[PDB]
Design a protein around this nucleic acid. Structure first.
Lengths: 72, 77
RNA sequence: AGACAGCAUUAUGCUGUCU
RNA sequence: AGACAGCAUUAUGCUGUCU
């Protein structure tokens, strides 16, 4: 395993989760939803390549993002 | 005369600006991999083009995006 | 050699926004 | 009709992780 690869996957999962929440509240435009769909497929493959549950990785990404924002 | 776009087009741009800022922080702390930086560089380009088309300053949209992201994260239940 | 993701360029099809 | 961003598919060149 590569730390930065893992970290970047978990962070990408968390930001997808934020984007998904925006889309579910019907607050995004169609190209935003198009990127949502592309990235969802992409994260399934990245997670499977890494042997990581996407839900757990999303939770870890949240922790990471909170830390890097706290350090601002 | 001139019109600002629909609400959702502006919201998506502001959210993307703010999420670009979060991603950039990860890169500046050397916590990302190389493809992640590749996407960072692509999207910084695209966001400048979008902001120009929209008549919006991405530095302002970033701060708006910050508020939108926090209001939906707090409201998440 | 394979799996996976991306970037760049290309061609084709399309979506959105603005004018 | 144009500008911008994107999505899909194609081709070419790369980058990264894993086996």
């Amino acid at each position: 395993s590569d730390s930065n690869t893992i970290t970047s996957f978990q962070v990408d999962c968390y930001l997808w989760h934020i984007r998904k929440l925006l889309s579910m509240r019907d607050m995004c435009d169609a190209p935003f939803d198009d990127r949502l769909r592309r990235d969802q497929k992409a994260l399934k493959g990245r997670g499977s390549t890494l042997g990581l549950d996407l839900r757990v990785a999303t939770m870890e990404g949240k922790k990471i993002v909170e830390d890097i924002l706290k350090s601002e």
